[PDB]
Every structure is written in structure tokens, then in C-alpha cells.
Amino acid sequence: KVFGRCELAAAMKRHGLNNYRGYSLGNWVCAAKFESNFNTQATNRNTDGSTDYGILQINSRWWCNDGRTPGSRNLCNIPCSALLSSDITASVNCAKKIVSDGNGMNAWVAWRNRCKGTDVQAWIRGCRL
Secondary structure (H helix, E strand, C coil): CECCHHHHHHHHHHCCCCCECCECHHHHHHHHHHHHCCECCCEEECCCCCEEECCCCEECCCCCECCCCCCCCCCCCCEHHHHHCCCCHHHHHHHHHHHCCCCHHHHCHHHHHHCCCCCHHHHHCCCCC
């Protein structure tokens, strides 16, 4: 499913992402925009053979099992396909563990490169939250 901006903002808020670990909602919405373009079915393969899955492009080498990434750790204990569902719950729960990993949102390269230090507030502007 391809979420609309405010729709995703509201769903993420309901799932406890607004200000989780100090990151305002605008950061999470900005990250989804640049990571998947709000599309839950987005996948991208990396050169190391691992694959990024879903709305937040979570990596198979550490967070989920896709049965084809040798040495994968499956820290969120879920098959990677669960991260592509229209219900963002699995994605959100796993993202919570990732952002708590000690490196914050820098774990998401698109966030670091395109959201970090920008007026992330613009991403939730106009939304009924």
C-alpha cells in the first residue's frame, strides 16, 4: 500500500513513533518518504546480497530473515515479508529496536542525507493529528 503523507503520520503517531527516542514525527515521515516513497511493498537489494524491506527499508542482514542472506541475525525475529504488509505494525516495532541500537536514526541513510537538519516539521504540516 502507498500511504498518503498525513495518513502515515497519523498511523505512526498511533503506533507511538512521535518523539520515540527523541525523534519528532516529522523525522519518521521524512524517512519513509525518502526510503520507500510511502510504499509498503518497496524492496531494494544491496551489493552485500542483503535486501532492504518496506516502508522504512529495514535490512535483512541484521533485522529480519528472508532466507537468503548468509549470516543474517534476525534481531526483530520476523520474516522480512511481514515488513511489506499494509499494516505498518511490524515495521514500526522493528524500527523501534533499530533506533534504540545506539546510532539513532542515522541507521537510515536517506534520513541522514535528506532529513537530518532540515525543517522536518514541514512533513506533518496541514495534517489533522
